[PDB]
Each structure stands twice: as C-alpha cells, then as structure tokens.
Amino acid sequence: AKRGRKKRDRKYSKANHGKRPN
Amino acid sequence: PTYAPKAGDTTRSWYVIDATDVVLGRLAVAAANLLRGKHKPTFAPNVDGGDFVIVINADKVAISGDKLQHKMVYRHSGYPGGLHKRTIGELMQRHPDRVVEKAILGMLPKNRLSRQIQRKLRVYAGPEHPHSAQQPVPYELKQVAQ
Amino acid sequence: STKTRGEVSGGGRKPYRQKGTGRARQGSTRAPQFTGGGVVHGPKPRDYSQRTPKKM
C-alpha cells in the first residue's frame, strides 16, 4: 500500500495545489 | 556572439580553505563553486573554469553531534545484501577528508566535466598541505550583503 | 485495358492455409499486391465522346 499512499500524498505539493491525476 | 572561452583562456589559481569551524555544507558549497569557477564572469558550463581548492583541517569541520551520530553514509558493493553503513562520526575518525570531498562531489554537477573538476580538489585532515610549491592564497567564506 | 485480379490467369486456389505458416494470409496468387497480379482500378476500354449540344 506504500506506493499508493506515496502517489496519493504527492498532490500535497505547492505546484500541484492539492490536486493530481488519479 | 556571446563570449565562449577558448583553450588557453582559463587562468587557474590555487586557494586554501580552512575548515576549522566551517559548517560542512557551507564549506562544500564554497569549494564546489570556487572549483567550478561560478565566481568568475568568464564562466561557461561546458568549460573547466575554476581554480584549485585545498581544504585543510578537514578533521574539524563543523558537524553537529546529532549528524555525527545519525547521518549515515551508504555504499552498495553490488552484491546482494552488500549495503554497507558507516556513520559520519566514524568517517570523521577514519577518513574525514573523504567526508568533506563527498560533500563537494555531491554539490558538483553530475556529468563528465565534473570528473575533471574534482581533480582540482585536495582535502587534508591536518593543518598542512603538500602544495606549497604554488602560492595558494587563503580563501575565507564570505556572503555578499543584499 | 488492364486485367483485374479475376481476369488474370490462374490465381484460383488459396495459395496456402490461412493460419500457421507464419506468412501473411493471401487468398490468391493474383491479388494486386502480388507481382504479376491483377491491376486495381486500372484502365478499362472507354469511350470519351461527349454530348455537347448542337448549337454549342
């Protein structure tokens, strides 16, 4: 589940503004 | 046509950096910049500008005790389970110059030119360096006020 | 005049079985992609006379 959680958490970057595909 | 340095336009000097109380990261940035030649207006990323840098008193670089205990240097031999762990603290006892040089090398660009760049770096644990045949000018770390 | 794939000599059998040979399926040795095969949309005998009106 680590890969999923890390991919999901990388929306929380300033450049992404809390939003990211999938 | 923007100036591009020729072969032979590069004049190289020699600096000595005293590492006696310098934070290791500050020292490494200064050494990398000075040894690349970012400080000279003739700089070109495809050219070996930059001067020779001798770091002395590498044994007493400023590394906080928490880093000396916890910051680990990792080396994989390529064999299974061949990850070897050392600690900054014990590389300070065995090869402190290796600690300083590893910091510099990490700051350097990861490319072929940096392989020649790092050839102009000497790091010494003690207060003495053998390169007195030149006249290596001391270089202190300064910050330009803004 | 040219000769379409149906008017070209031979070409009746399927040259080999559809599956298993490792080759492209072909259907006929006289298919247009074959050398010596039929011509696709080739010239056929035509009459080019037009019906221009008399007073024209």
Binding site: - | T2, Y3, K38, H39, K40, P41, T42, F43, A44, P45, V144, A145, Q146 | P43
Partner: protein, 124 residues
Amino acid sequence: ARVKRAVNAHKKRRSILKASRGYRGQRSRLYRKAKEQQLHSLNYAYRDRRARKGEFRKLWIARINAAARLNDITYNRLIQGLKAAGVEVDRKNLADIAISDPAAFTALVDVARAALPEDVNAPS
C-alpha cells in the same frame, strides 16, 4: 498512362538522406530510418531555437552575477539598481562588458548601488 514512380519518388529520399549526413548507424544510411530521425531533429531544432533564448540569458545572468559579486553586489540588487538608475542595457551586453570591460562594469555597479534605496528591505 502508366507512370513509373522512381523519378518523382527519389527526390524526397535524396533530400532526407542529405539532411541526415553525419547521423550514425542506419539513421544516415536508410531513408525510412533517416526520416524518423529527421522528424526528431527538426522538432529538436524548433524546440531549441526558442530554448536557447533562455539558455543564453541564463548564461548571461550567471556571468553578470559572478561579476557583480566581484564588485560586492548581488545580481538581485544590481538589476534593481540599473532599473532605478534608468539603465536599459540588457544582460547580453551586461555580461559581455562584464567580460570585456570590467572597469565599465564596476562603474555600472556604482550607479546601481547609488540608485538602490537606502534601506533596500523596508517597504516603499
């Protein structure tokens, strides 16, 4: 009217292979492989003609900043200083005179320092 294709067909092949001279492997020998690499080459050239405008200005700023901190000013504040002083010399020539005429560059630093506000850090 049956038309042989070769006379017309070979024209674009000659052009593609001539443009592909110097390529290594099949990319300079084979028209099909040279054509793919020509699409990449012209895409790359188009990309890099507008990328070099940032590349050269990156290099100009690097050199300008190096010269500025030989004259004890950051590029940060030297650009303010020239703006405020009204100096509209672009970084092409700023870097090029930082190399060719360092004394003139020092003069420009002096005027930039003068034009800088006394407290560069307080609100305006």
